[PDB]
């Protein structure tokens, strides 16, 4: 029964996101759990291994393992059900399916309220999911509780990210100056962290977007340049930064460079499936500013299939396009817009 306590210890190391302890416990308990008998204990270990699997970003193995864990959900402890929902949530988050992920995270939330179990990472993940699902009031609402938990658990590295969430919130909400005043403070106090580069990259990118929206296209491409200078991976932030760069470049009436940018995004997005949504975005942009053909309209119907306010933007773009020509389509379009957006 020491295996049980060691599993609880493994969970303790997994929630703190410790690195060396998690690995140590993982391997030594991998050696210790050759006596697999108790079903609940074994499945508990399977779920802790699910979280450990999330910690290493192995999406495929995570999905397969969650499928094996899916078959035997009927005989789970409430805690195990909770863990499963959370695991599926983060799995959906890794696949950039923020809607489904949000759903699993909400069910995980209500289960957490039912069981009385608590960890701030949940609220943070929900807030992040909402932030990806477009400037929800619940994003700030959840990120405040996230701050509440993190500040009590000394999770400053997470606190600053929460501040980034609030920053993009204020950014897209309209209040640019306050967002800037926060972002600068982030820049000043990011250098003390061991992983300053990512924070700097994100902050400079978002700053570039803000300056872009202010009309200052000169600082935008600069901050974008420094961001690209500081980036080091191929996440959606990279593709988005490339997209923003392409925007500010095409606002300066520059040629070919923006094309090289959007292509540089197109291939990298064609690579690993996850980016397809984002991919579509940039390719759609290209169809708007490079082929000069209305063929995209056909594809618009297609892009109306997997579908967020972005949809509203597309259909309202088709609405203003139609208002230039044919009324009826624009009428029904914006009707759907203002009536479904609420």
């Amino acid at each position: 029964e020491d295996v049980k306590g060691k599993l609880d210890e493994w969970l303790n190391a997994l929630v703190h996101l410790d690195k060396q302890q998690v690995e140590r416990i993982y391997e030594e308990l991998q050696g210790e759990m050759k006596h697999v008998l108790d079903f609940e204990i074994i499945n508990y270990y399977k779920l802790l291994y699910t979280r450990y699997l999330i910690m290493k970003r192995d999406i495929s193995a995570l999905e397969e393992e969650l499928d094996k864990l899916k078959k035997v959900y009927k005989k789970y402890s409430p805690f195990q059900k909770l863990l499963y929902m959370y695991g599926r949530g983060l799995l959906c988050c890794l696949q950039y399916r923020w809607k489904d992920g949000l759903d699993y995270l909400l069910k995980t939330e209500v289960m957490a309220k039912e069981q009385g179990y608590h960890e701030t990472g949940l609220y943070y993940n929900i807030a992040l999911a909402y932030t990806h699902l477009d400037i929800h009031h619940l994003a700030i609402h959840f990120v405040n509780m996230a701050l509440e938990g993190f500040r009590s658990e000394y999770k400053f590295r997470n606190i600053i990210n929460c501040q980034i969430l609030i920053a993009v919130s204020y950014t897209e909400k309209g209040q640019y100056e306050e967002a800037l005043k926060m972002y600068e403070s982030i820049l000043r106090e990011a250098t003390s962290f061991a992983d300053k580069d990512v924070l700097l990259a994100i902050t400079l990118s978002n700053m570039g977007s803000i300056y872009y929206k202010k009309g200052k296209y000169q600082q935008a491409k600069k901050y974008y340049l420094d961001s690209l200078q500081l980036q080091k991976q191929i996440d959606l932030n990279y593709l988005d930064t490339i997209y923003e760069m392409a925007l500010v470049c095409i606002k300066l009436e520059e040629l070919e460079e923006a094309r090289t940018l959007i292509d540089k995004g197109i291939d990298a997005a064609k690579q690993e499936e996850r980016f397809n949504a984002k991919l579509y975005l940039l390719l759609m942009l290209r169809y708007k500013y490079f082929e000069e053909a209305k063929d995209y309209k056909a594809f618009l119907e297609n892009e109306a299939i997997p579908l967020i306010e972005l949809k509203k933007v597309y259909v309202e773009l088709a609405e203003h396009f139609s208002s230039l020509s044919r009324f009826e389509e624009s009428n029904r379009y914006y009707r759907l817009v203002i009536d479904l957006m609420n």
Partner: peptide, 8 residues
């Protein structure tokens, strides 16, 4: 339009 990483 850049967001940080998840906790997990």
């Amino acid at each position: 339009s850049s967001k940080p990483d998840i906790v997990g």
